[PDB]
Amino acid sequence: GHLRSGPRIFAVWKGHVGQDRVDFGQTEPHTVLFHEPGSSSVWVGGRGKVYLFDFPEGKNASVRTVNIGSTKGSCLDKRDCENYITLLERRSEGLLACGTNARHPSCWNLVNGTVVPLGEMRGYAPFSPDENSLVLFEGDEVYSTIRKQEYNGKIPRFRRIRGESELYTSDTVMQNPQFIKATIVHQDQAYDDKIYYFFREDNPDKNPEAPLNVSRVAQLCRGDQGGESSLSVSKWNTFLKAMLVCSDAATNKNFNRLQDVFLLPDPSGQWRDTRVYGVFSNPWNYSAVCVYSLGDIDKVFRTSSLKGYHSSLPNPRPGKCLPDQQPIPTETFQVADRHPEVAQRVEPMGPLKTPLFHSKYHYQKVAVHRMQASHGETFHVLYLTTDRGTIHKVVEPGEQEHSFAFNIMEIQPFRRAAAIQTMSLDAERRKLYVSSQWEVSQVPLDLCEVYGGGCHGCLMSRDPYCGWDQGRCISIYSSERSVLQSINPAEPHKECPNPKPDKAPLQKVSLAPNSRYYLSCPMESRHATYSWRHKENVEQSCEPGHQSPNCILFIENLTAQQYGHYFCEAQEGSYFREAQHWQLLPED
Amino acid sequence: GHLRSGPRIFAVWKGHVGQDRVDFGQTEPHTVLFHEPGSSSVWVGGRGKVYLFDFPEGKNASVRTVNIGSTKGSCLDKRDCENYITLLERRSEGLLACGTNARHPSCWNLVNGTVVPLGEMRGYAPFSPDENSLVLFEGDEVYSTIRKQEYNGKIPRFRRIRGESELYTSDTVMQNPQFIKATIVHQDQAYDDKIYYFFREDNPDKNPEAPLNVSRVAQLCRGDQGGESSLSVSKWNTFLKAMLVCSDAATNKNFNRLQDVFLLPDPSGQWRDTRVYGVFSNPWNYSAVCVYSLGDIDKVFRTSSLKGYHSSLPNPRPGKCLPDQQPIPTETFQVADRHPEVAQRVEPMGPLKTPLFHSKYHYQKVAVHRMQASHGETFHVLYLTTDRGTIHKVVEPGEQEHSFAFNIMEIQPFRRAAAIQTMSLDAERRKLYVSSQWEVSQVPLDLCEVYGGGCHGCLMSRDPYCGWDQGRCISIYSSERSVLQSINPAEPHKECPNPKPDKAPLQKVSLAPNSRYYLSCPMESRHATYSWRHKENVEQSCEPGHQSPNCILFIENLTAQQYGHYFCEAQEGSYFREAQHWQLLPED
Numbered sequence A, B: 001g002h003l004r005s006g007p008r009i010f011a012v013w014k015g016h017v018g019q020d021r022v023d024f025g026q027t028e029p030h031t032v033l034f035h036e037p038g039s040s041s042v043w044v045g046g047r048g049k050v051y052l053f054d055f056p057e058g059k060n061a062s063v064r065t066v067n068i069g070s071t072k073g074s075c076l077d078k079r080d081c082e083n084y085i086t087l088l089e090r091r092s093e094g095l096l097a098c099g100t101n102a103r104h105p106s107c108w109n110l111v112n113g114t115v116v117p118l119g120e121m122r123g124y125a126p127f128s129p130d131e132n133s134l135v136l137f138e139g140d141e142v143y144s145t146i147r148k149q150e151y152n153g154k155i156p157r158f159r160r161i162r163g164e165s166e167l168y169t170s171d172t173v174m175q176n177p178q179f180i181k182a183t184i185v186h187q188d189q190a191y192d193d194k195i196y197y198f199f200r201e202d203n204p205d206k207n208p209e210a211p212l213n214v215s216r217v218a219q220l221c222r223g224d225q226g227g228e229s230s231l232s233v234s235k236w237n238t239f240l241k242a243m244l245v246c247s248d249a250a251t252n253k254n255f256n257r258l259q260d261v262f263l264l265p266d267p268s269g270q271w272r273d274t275r276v277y278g279v280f281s282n283p284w285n286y287s288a289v290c291v292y293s294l295g296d297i298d299k300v301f302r303t304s305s306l307k308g309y310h311s312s313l314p315n316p317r318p319g320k321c322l323p324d325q326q327p328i329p330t331e332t333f334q335v336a337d338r339h340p341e342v343a344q345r346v347e348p349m350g351p352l353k354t355p356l357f358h359s360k361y362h363y364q365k366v367a368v369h370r371m372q373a374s375h376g377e378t379f380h381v382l383y384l385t386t387d388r389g390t391i392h393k394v395v396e397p398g399e400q401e402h403s404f405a406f407n408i409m410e411i412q413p414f415r416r417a418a419a420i421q422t423m424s425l426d427a428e429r430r431k432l433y434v435s436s437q438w439e440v441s442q443v444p445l446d447l448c449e450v451y452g453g454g455c456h457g458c459l460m461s462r463d464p465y466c467g468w469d470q471g472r473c474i475s476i477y478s479s480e481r482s483v484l485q486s487i488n489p490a491e492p493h494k495e496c497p498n499p500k501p502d503k504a505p506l507q508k509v510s511l512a513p514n515s516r517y518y519l520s521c522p523m524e525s526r527h528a529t530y531s532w533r534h535k536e537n538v539e540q541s542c543e544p545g546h547q548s549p550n551c552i553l554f555i556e557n558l559t560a561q562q563y564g565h566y567f568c569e570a571q572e573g574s575y576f577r578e579a580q581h582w583q584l585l586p587e588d
């Protein structure tokens, strides 16, 4: 195909000082970020407090710290008795904030500039921040992955902590799981409502050539009553899990390590159309992004046979929810409990169950925005974080073989380059909130001052969020409900006033013979090939996989033959552009 | 660990004109190379002829062509009726040469400048040169993977073409096999002799996350009589196959695609100690080298259960050779014929079944030479061809965690850069024979004119084949029986006359202010970090992953401040070296 999976532009963000990003007073190793779409406030739980950020549109942003210290039993022999706020959820009672509280998990409520404690609440926050925690809210129910006690066993479980009855996953359903994400899926009838959650676990296949871990999606019935026996009453009786596969067909490249998940509801309102985007990596830290539909996952769960069970399944099929608050029959539960893994794998959406794309970058988080271009065309744009603390903006492919993912840009969003610890996409304000151990940054999705290059450079960027107008490249959500934006196919520059690009400004230099010199051409587009030409002969050529950001022609001891005009030309596809034009004139 | 898996030096071979390599008269796409260790002759089968190369030590080499034209029925409607020589084997009767002969497989005997035809001999040569062929000779028995007829099925087989009776492998033992290499293995008793062969085939595992092909080693009893029934008489009744695994422990990295195998008998003469070196790649064309022992492979074959078979095995065990020419019992053959894969995998030798090393290069062939250093120490040196037409010389690791494979050098052995078609190591003459589509080249295993960093460079090379003597870096097999060679541990330069390296020659240059300029430092050692220093500060730093071969410090418009000394210093581990020394003097 085409290696356009690399960022085309290494953006340089010239924002509006004091408006785009704010630092914490100190360094916060463990954090959590909360932000509701549309709001101008951003909450961050840190060490012994919760930062309140304000990002007023078009105006300077600021902080505000609300200390909620470990003041509930300070430790003698001070070591690490901080109160890391690891949770921030908004309830009708206000903003719930839970923290470790010197190994005494508790929660507080923030309503009106108030800090009302609710005391110890196990299962709402770990005993240590560096733990693989997870809690989900739905109505007056809460599900958690956090142990309720410290001397608890070494078996992580998914539990309903608040609700009709407390339920926990049994010892046979997972093997050293690492939870990623969890959601509620509302099916056709309310009693069929499922809870899905994604995680990684040990591979049941212990052969030496099998990868150590595998990726999964598990389902549970929201209205699971519990089992019939005294031992099965308090356990989930509707568990089932499936393997998630993200592999390229053309090549035999597999990405088994699921890193992050992002759900995107379809404009149709149909739950089956909800998209599950997953970022996967492999032993080399290369990644791929696969997309699954809730409909496919559910179909697998209700028709696939179970691994290791070779006989007709019980009437109430394992995993199937039951109508009128009926508990799962023992016979049905025992099959499920012994054979929790379905046999068929969950593969990506549509024909050719292949990834949207893959690359040699190490991606950790993903967020997606379905959006409309100036001309009404709909595009899905993915935002990925690398383990190098940067963000990639990729346009998802559409039609067929002619369409591929297009990595339009990479950006380093912080004042101080660092690892990205959290990321949240606000599709309402069209902003991307990212944070590190030092600051919090608000990155616009419609950032286009980055594409220079006149009108051609603007449309050649392929960024669906912008177009050319009033002599500049600006956001389509700007004001004037109309801008010159391009057409998908090759040569998207055709719609500019000048059918052909601007010539480079002529640069002159006078040099004596035998002198040592060099000509540098900074390569803006990383998809282009750059050539230095003299007397119609290419003297130097720099291809897209070029490490240095400049294509340099070295002139050793200048000879008479090497006097004159030197052009550095850029060629992407069938597009050509004069990037540099020098003239070496004799002067001794 | 350490990434010393990349070549430390890109050798530049200045040999002896007319002595090192000879071209064919024309271009040969399909070739075979024969060469008996110690000989000065190299035979190469090609299109309609066989080449006779002569590589007289210390003297110019030459060619000689012996046309064996398709003169045995020239085709009407000429297309591709050549007689590609695909086999060269010397027997007591003389040099056996077999070819395609216009889709009419035949052999010829070359005794004393004569070309005696033996006529059509199916199984000795394919019908087309691009076919996956394999023929093995042992005593008066010949084995082959080549079909005997052109209208034959789509099932490749391993057959005994010459011997007491013809035996062929059944339809059930392999699925689209691609043969790599075969060998006879003499065990304790003659009747236990085995034939082992390596190959790739389809993965029986059809799950979407499973890789498409897998690597195997198969075993057959040389003394196999056949079966007991009319249908099994002519079939091999002792076939068993096992998956060959080459995966890294630390990382989870798997290399499932076997590319080439090389056998190295132990000095002890113990078959069980024979080493099997396999080169493996993966979907990304990255590679690793794993080592196995005939002992470990045999233990797997006689002790492992069979995949898919869960009952006590038959008394005479599947794959076990029988004493007095007894045919394999039907009850034994049927278990084997239905379950030919043993369940346990063959893993690398020694504790921590891991590769000797892996790198991001795409290796295709391997040869190993056990050698002794000047001080009697023994090292195993690997010779690997990349798919870029180069050879890598790696030194196998020894002791423990402190020892790692060391890639000491890369070399382009041809006058014309091309893909390496064949490679054969002659431990007798200490040479490596490599061929392409245009030439054949003899490469010394003891090449050291390549290391030129004075005494220190020579020892810093870690190349066990050489040391410093008579004011130069030379081969330990040269003459004086005694040279100054280094010590395995860090800082192997210590044993040189001057305890510390030679300062770099001073270079002066006069320039006027505001003049543009640059300093280039060719980076010889690819394992060192190079730094340009001025006024005690580094202005430019180049780390090992540096693409270009030069560390360049750029000087825009020269200023008064930036006048003076400039040093380019290289530093591998705890070793320093002045690679360049410039002094910019003022002059207008």
Ligand SMILES: *[C@@H]1O[C@H](CO)[C@@H](O)[C@H](O)[C@H]1NC(C)=O
Pocket (backbone or CB within 6 Å): A017, A018, A019, A060
């Ligand atoms: C925003 O912060 C900047 C600090 O760089 C400050 O100069 C400016 O006054 C603030 N914005 C305004 C105009 O209030």
Ligand SMILES: *[C@@H]1O[C@H](CO)[C@@H](O)[C@H](O)[C@H]1NC(C)=O
Pocket (backbone or CB within 6 Å): A092, A093, A094, A111, A112
């Ligand atoms: C916030 O304060 C207002 C007025 O003081 C009060 O009416 C309201 O109940 C408070 N919020 C909650 C839910 O405690």
Ligand SMILES: *[C@@H]1O[C@H](CO)[C@@H](O)[C@H](O)[C@H]1NC(C)=O
Pocket (backbone or CB within 6 Å): A178, A201, A202, A212, A213
């Ligand atoms: C699989 O990966 C997880 C998380 O990366 C790790 O905790 C676990 O130990 C790994 N499995 C094994 C046994 O190596």
Ligand SMILES: *[C@@H]1O[C@H](CO)[C@@H](O)[C@H](O)[C@H]1NC(C)=O
Pocket (backbone or CB within 6 Å): A283, A284, A285, A362, A387
């Ligand atoms: C990427 O993978 C490597 C192993 O190949 C690992 O050591 C490294 O930590 C990973 N990158 C990061 C920093 O997450």
Ligand SMILES: *[C@@H]1O[C@H](CO)[C@@H](O)[C@H](O)[C@H]1NC(C)=O
Pocket (backbone or CB within 6 Å): B017, B018, B019, B060
């Ligand atoms: C060996 O070949 C080279 C180049 O073909 C030639 O210059 C040289 O004279 C030859 N050696 C002799 C002494 O014939």
Ligand SMILES: *[C@@H]1O[C@H](CO)[C@@H](O)[C@H](O)[C@H]1NC(C)=O
Pocket (backbone or CB within 6 Å): B111, B112, B114
């Ligand atoms: C070739 O040499 C062998 C052994 O020296 C001899 O038997 C044979 O006759 C020779 N070939 C011919 C036909 O001269």
Ligand SMILES: *[C@H]1O[C@H](CO)[C@@H](O)[C@H](O)[C@H]1NC(C)=O
Pocket (backbone or CB within 6 Å): B176, B202, B212, B213
């Ligand atoms: C497995 O891979 C090999 C080599 O890459 C290829 O020749 C073979 O056709 C593949 N197997 C199948 C049937 O796809």
